[PDB]
Amino acid sequence: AKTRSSRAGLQFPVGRVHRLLRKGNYSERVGAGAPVYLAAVLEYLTAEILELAGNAARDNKKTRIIPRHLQLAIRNDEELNKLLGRVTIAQGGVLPNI
Amino acid sequence: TRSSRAGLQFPVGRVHRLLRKGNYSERVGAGAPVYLAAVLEYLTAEILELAGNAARDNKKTRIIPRHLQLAIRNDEELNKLLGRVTIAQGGVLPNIQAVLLPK
Amino acid sequence: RERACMLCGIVLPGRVFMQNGCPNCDSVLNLRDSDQATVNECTSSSFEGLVAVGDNEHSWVAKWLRVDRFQPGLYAVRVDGRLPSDIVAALEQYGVYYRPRDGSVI
Amino acid sequence: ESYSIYVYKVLKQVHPDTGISSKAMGIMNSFVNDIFERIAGEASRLAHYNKRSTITSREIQTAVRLLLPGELAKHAVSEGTKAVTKYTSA
Amino acid sequence: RSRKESYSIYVYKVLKQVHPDTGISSKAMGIMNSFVNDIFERIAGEASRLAHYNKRSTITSREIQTAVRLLLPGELAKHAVSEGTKAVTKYTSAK
Amino acid sequence: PGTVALREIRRYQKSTELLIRKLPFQRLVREIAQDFKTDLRFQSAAIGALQEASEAYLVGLFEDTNLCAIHAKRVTIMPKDIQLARRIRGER
Amino acid sequence: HRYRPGTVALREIRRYQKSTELLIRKLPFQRLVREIAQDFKTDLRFQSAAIGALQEASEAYLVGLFEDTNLCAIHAKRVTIMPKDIQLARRIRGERA
Amino acid sequence: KVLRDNIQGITKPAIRRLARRGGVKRISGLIYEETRGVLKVFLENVIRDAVTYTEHAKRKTVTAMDVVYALKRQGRTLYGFGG
Amino acid sequence: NIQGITKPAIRRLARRGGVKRISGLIYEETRGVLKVFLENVIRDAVTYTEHAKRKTVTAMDVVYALKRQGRTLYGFGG
DNA sequence: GGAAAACACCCAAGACACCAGGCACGAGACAGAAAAAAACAACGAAAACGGCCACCACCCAAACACACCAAACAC
DNA sequence: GTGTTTGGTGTGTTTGGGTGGTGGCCGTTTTCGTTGTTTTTTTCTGTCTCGTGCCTGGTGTCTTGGGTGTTTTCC
Ligand SMILES: [Zn+2]
């Protein structure tokens, strides 16, 4: 298992996250599991969002996810919308709410 | 000292060291700390001028947090700059709404 | 890339169906107002027998293909795939009877 | 650089019969970059708060605790600890 | 012992420069120290973000000036830019 | 009176398309930018992002204005509701 | 004699927009802070300055909220603040969803 | 060529559409001007920053990233256009 | 311990906030809002404390937690 | 806060017209890249005074006691 | 109004501890050349932004009707 992703069972690039941690001016040194931990969290969060985006694209009888479904997924989830309350989504529209 | 050379009262060496040790950029040019010390000195001078005015208005010779709060919330540009900060023991400006005043 | 609208039998590019919808079936299908899944379920790119109709009123072929009340253009003798059960029920709600053009029903 | 192939990987892992538009991938890339910036900035802020010059997984864990809300934080912490534990084991 | 730095003496110098017959409480000196630290942090963060946006390794007076321009309101920004340019030119002309 | 308004509400909440016309908005943006630097060029994506942000902002503001107007036990939004909303939001 | 209801209220408003002293009893607030904190970790100690900062921030927040509440109440053409006024103000700030 | 008073290119039906998407049922005739001013003050605040970025990069073209940074600076993070 | 915030104290805070008349449910509403606010701030502070591996909650932890929310406070050592 | 009057604001329906919009082509400023070229920032070092800590003494205004003032509400 | 009379601002003498100033020292800014590279500089390519032009009709909009929902009034 040459890749750090395989060694961790991940899909995101551990090496790019490490590179970004170093060439990003956050600290003089970086651990060895800090990039791994952050990549795991990021992959989990993207999967979490993609779950609801797939749900929303399937609720609109659509096979492809578009910005509308990402907007719906984010603005319909209590925790994601609290996390992402100050983020504008392009072509996301609004939620039908009368 | 580098403050005298620039006709300043704020420290240039201290500010340069804080910029250097703050992980802000790989390197720091030499015209940034002089400029920043001048800006900070100007802003503190403005604050202290208005706070001294506010303390004299109350006929006091020493600035307390109340005068800082009054000076900040009374100046439009500063109040826009310090719009989210709360000052401990600063109070509020005296402000009674028009409709609550007696008739 | 061209697809054949299952209901009326017209053949137009799939992107045209998505962007503008069926000029004839929009009164009952709302193809433009429908997602890609519904567009595929009502417009199929797999078909046979390209047909060009000039005058719907007097063409016996158009009457034989039941397209004499539609816009002249590209039409397909046989279209692969049928309308879904939910869309069939929705059309039956409107009072319109759907006759498949797949050839398996005659 | 973009996270598009990784989002495809995650999507097919999660939703084999769903596809993503170009704009939705742009949004996802913006989201990933934004979250990385937030978390890394908070980790640096913590390191400075505690007079440290290294970002270790503890700083990242408590940064995730600060940023994410309760249940989200709990699940993300579990995911990160699982991944770090298995990377250490391997 | 604990030789920790602050801006108290500089705040006092500025006070005696603007208001000779006015003192300052310790709590107000604390507020002024917190204010100085805050403004430093804001300006340095903006300058860092700008340098990294423009792919530069150096924080010069241009970055500081444009962060000041972005951050302060019209008259305040104008006076601050005047002050900074004056000080920079006075510092550079001498040595 | 009152049905087509609900139909328009429903329609526009179902959609995402920008509501301000693109070229009048482009010219307005150029006119405003003409104060900050003379004879500027603009990327198209810059104008698109600006229009998306402006419409999102205005829609949120209209949401808050409707909330205030309903609070006042009304149904018609008036400029003082917008003013109250911008005051409470902390806008200058 | 007797004052109209609201005259002593305005005298108090003038008195309290002038002063800066904390309007909550300190010990109840300290006990409340420890009770709340005890739901995250038992046997916690607090420097007195931490409680002071918490009390200052909480009162400052509440006063700003009361200002917004007054704005809402006067907008509705009323004078008495109500829980619905608070809920509307907290929603409009972006504090309540 | 100089642009003069193009705020009225935000037609009244456009403002009505923005209000309807916002959930407004009955719109006062003075709203449209209110809104117009508000939008002006917003755009003037965003553009002033975007231009500030463009001039600091010693450029002559306003890029999409300049807009993205100006919005990010105001807490207006925008997904879809970069970030 | 939330009833230690008596009605007169909430009245004092509303009067400094300019409130002339007060309903009867405002007191419970204010207790709930304050509890939520304090909960958030203390959650952040306790997170900071646990991370710093301490058993005492300092004023710096509160100040960083308020800086996290955006409620910057001057005069406590910042 | 509820009930009551009522009026005119805003929407709604309609026809007329504009210019946005759509597309195109042309031109080229300026952006992106490349190659060149140097002063500037970092490094070590030595260097000296400013800024820190201690400690001292004075007087602003905190405090307590008097008073005139001038709004409050009663009449 | 007319009136007494509660509220609040102005005034004075008294206390003191915290503001201010001054001595001692140590550590951090300072002056400095060299190193090395991030800049600046110049020159070149070429995309896309500006620039303009035509035609269509989606859209903008001017206006009559009018009703409902806002503002006021009484209790
Ligand atoms: Zn059809």
Number of inter-chain CB pairs under 8 A, A vs F: 26
- CB of D49 within 8 A of CB of A10? no
Nearest nt by C1' to E59 Cα: J41
Domain coordinates in residue numbering, chain A: 3-98
Token pair for H12: 């009244």
Looking at domain A3-98, its CATH class is: mainly alpha
Q: Where are the beta strands (DSSP E) in B46-85?
A: 62-63
Nearest nt by C1' to E56 Cα: K38
* Angstrom distance (rounded) from CA H49 to CA H52: 5
* Angstrom distance (rounded) from CA E87 to CA F75: 58
Which positions in chain D have a beta carbon within 8 angstroms of at least one beta carbon in chain B? 44, 48
Residue H3 CB partners (closer than 8 Å, separation 6+):
F27, F28, F30, F31, F34
Give the residue from H30, H35, H1, H37 showing the smallest Cα distance to H15. H35
* Angstrom distance (rounded) from CA C70 to CA F18: 34
Q: Where are the beta strands (DSSP E) in I1-78?
A: 21-22, 56-57, 73-74
Instruction: Assess I52–G contact: CB distance below 8 Å, yes or no.
Output: no
How many angstroms separate the CA of residue C88 from the nearest CA in chain A?
A: 16
Residue C42 is assigned to a ligand binding site: no
Which helix (H) or strand (E) is A89 found in, with range? strand A87-89
Token pair for F4: 């087509």
Residue D39 CB partners (closer than 8 Å, separation 6+):
A38, A41, D60, D63, D64, D67
Test the A interface: residue of D12, D21, D25, D34 with most A CBs within 10 Å: D21
3-state secondary structure of B24: coil
E31–I77 CB contact, under 8 Å: no
Backbone angles phi, psi at A17, to 5 degrees: -65, -40
Nearest nt by C1' to B9 Cα: J50
* Angstrom distance (rounded) from CA C53 to CA D84: 68
Residue A63: closest C-alpha in chain C:
C37
H83–D23 CB contact, under 8 Å: no
Q: What angle do CA A88, G85, A86 make, to 5 degrees?
A: 10
* Angstrom distance (rounded) from CA F58 to CA F52: 10
Q: In Å, what resolution does this model reach?
A: 3.4
How many angstroms separate the CA of residue G37 from the nearest CA in chain I?
A: 6
* Selected residues 45-84 of chain B with any CB under 8 Å from a CB in chain I: 65, 84
* Angstrom distance (rounded) from CA B43 to CA E80: 8
Whether the CB of F3 is less than 7 Å away from nucleic strand K comes out as no
Domains for chain D: give ranges and CATH numbers: 1-90 (1.10.20.10)
- Verify D-H touch: 3 or more CB pairs within 8 A: yes
Token pair for E41: 């942090």
Beta bridge partners of residue C12, listed in sequence order: C3
- CB of I49 within 8 A of CB of B64? no
Residues less than 5 Å from ion ligand 1, measured at CB:
C 5, 7-8, 22, 24-25
Residues of I with CB below 8 A from G34's CB?
1
Give the CA-to-C1' distance from I2 to K18 in angstroms: 38
Q: Is D79 exposed, middle or buried (0-12, 13-18, 19+ CB in 10 A)?
A: buried
Instruction: Assess F67–G contact: CB distance below 8 Å, yes or no.
Output: yes
Token pair for A53: 């985006």
Buried b / exposed e over H11-26, threshold 16 CB at 10 Å, is eeebbbbbbbbbbbbb
Query: CB-CB: which of I18, I20, I76 is closest to B88?
Result: I76
Token pair for F47: 């104008």
Instruction: Assess A93–F contact: CB distance below 8 Å, yes or no.
Output: yes
Pairing between strand I56-57 and G80-81?
Answer: unpaired
How many angstroms separate the CA of residue B32 from the nearest CA in chain I?
A: 24
Beta bridge partners of residue G46, listed in sequence order: I57
Instruction: Assess A63–C contact: CB distance below 8 Å, yes or no.
Output: yes
* Cβ < 7 Å from strand K, B residues 11-30: 11-14, 16-17, 26-27
Pairing between strand G45-46 and I56-57?
Answer: parallel
Write the DSSP assignment of H7-68 as a string of letters.
GGGS-HHHHHHHHHHTT-SEE-TTHHHHHHHHHHHHHHHHHHHHHHHHHHTT-SEE-HHHHH
Residues of I with CB below 8 A from B100's CB?
18, 20
3-state secondary structure of H78: strand
Compute, in angstroms, the gap from residue A59 CA to the centroid of ligand 1. 24
How many angstroms separate the CA of residue F24 from the nearest CA in chain B?
A: 32
Token pair for I37: 């606010």
* Angstrom distance (rounded) from CA I13 to CA I26: 12
E66–H52 CB contact, under 8 Å: yes
CA dihedral in degrees (H33, H34, H36, H38; nearest 10)?
A: 160
In Å, the largest CA–CA distance within chain D is: 49
Give the CA-to-C1' distance from D48 to J46 in angstroms: 32
Compute, in angstroms, the gap from residue C13 CA to the centroid of ligand 1. 12
Which positions in chain F have a beta carbon within 8 angstroms of at least one beta carbon in chain B? 90, 92
Backbone angles phi, psi at D19, to 5 degrees: -125, 160
Give the CA-to-C1' distance from E36 to K40 in angstroms: 34
Write the DSSP assignment of G21-58 as a string of letters.
S--S-HHHHHHHHHHHHTTT-SS-EE-HHHHHHHHHHH
Give the residue from D11, B48, E84 showing the smallest Cα distance to A65. D11
> Edge-to-edge strands of the sheet including C11-12?
C11-12, C3-5, C43-44
Q: Where are the beta strands (DSSP E) in D18-78?
A: 19-20, 54-55
DSSP structure class, residue C44: E
Instruction: Assess A91–B contact: CB distance below 8 Å, yes or no.
Output: no
Q: Where are the beta strands (DSSP E) in chain D?
A: 19-20, 54-55
- Residue A54 identity: G
- CB of G91 within 8 A of CB of I31? no
How many angstroms separate the CA of residue B77 from the nearest CA in chain D?
A: 29
Give the CA-to-C1' distance from A57 to J19 in angstroms: 38
Token pair for G17: 């927009």
How many angstroms separate the CA of residue B25 from the nearest CA in chain A?
A: 7
Q: What angle do CA I41, I42, I48 make, to 5 degrees?
A: 95
* Angstrom distance (rounded) from CA G56 to CA G71: 23
Residue C8 is assigned to a ligand binding site: yes
- Residue F33 identity: A
Buried b / exposed e over D36-74, threshold 16 CB at 10 Å, is beebbebbbbbbeeeebeebbbbbbbbbbbbbbeeebbe
Chain K positions within 7 A of any protein Cβ atom are: 6-9, 18-20, 27-32, 38-39, 48-52, 59-61, 66-71
Domain coordinates in residue numbering, chain H: 4-83
Considering the segment(s) I1-78 as one domain, its CATH architecture is: Orthogonal Bundle (1.10)
Give the residue from I75, A60, A30 showing the smallest Cα distance to D54. A30
Report the phi/psi class of residue I23: left, alpha or beta, with left for phi > 0 and alpha for psi in -120 to 50.
beta
Token pair for E37: 């630290």
Beta bridge partners of residue C5, listed in sequence order: C43
Chains with 3 or more CB pairs closer than 8 angstroms to B? A, D, E, F, G, I
Question: How many CA within 13 A on the CB side of residue F65?
Answer: 31
E17–B45 CB contact, under 8 Å: yes
**Sole residue written with tokens 């409707």:** F66
* Angstrom distance (rounded) from CA F28 to CA F47: 10
For nucleotide K50, give the residue with the nearest CA to its C1': F41
* Angstrom distance (rounded) from CA F54 to CA H43: 7
Domains for chain C: give ranges and CATH numbers: 2-103 (3.30.40.210)
Buried b / exposed e over F22-57, threshold 16 CB at 10 Å, is eebbbebbbbbbbebeeebebeebbbbbbbbbbbbb
Give the CA-to-C1' distance from F1 to K67 in angstroms: 8
Which helix (H) or strand (E) is A39 found in, with range? helix A34-59
Looking at domain G1-97, its CATH class is: mainly alpha
- CB of A10 within 8 A of CB of A43? yes
* Cβ < 7 Å from strand K, B residues 63-92: none
- CB of E74 within 8 A of CB of B75? no
Q: H4-83: which CATH number, 3.20.20.70, 1.10.287.1770, 3.30.565.10, 1.10.20.10?
A: 1.10.20.10
I57–G46 CB contact, under 8 Å: yes
* Angstrom distance (rounded) from CA H58 to CA H56: 5
Q: Which fold has domain B1-103?
A: Histone, subunit A (1.10.20)
- CB of G80 within 8 A of CB of G69? no
Q: Which fold has domain F1-92?
A: Histone, subunit A (1.10.20)
Pairing between strand H26-27 and E58-59?
Answer: unpaired
* Cβ < 7 Å from strand K, E residues 31-90: 51, 55-58
I14–G65 CB contact, under 8 Å: no
Token pair for D13: 């892992």
Backbone angles phi, psi at F41, to 5 degrees: -105, 150
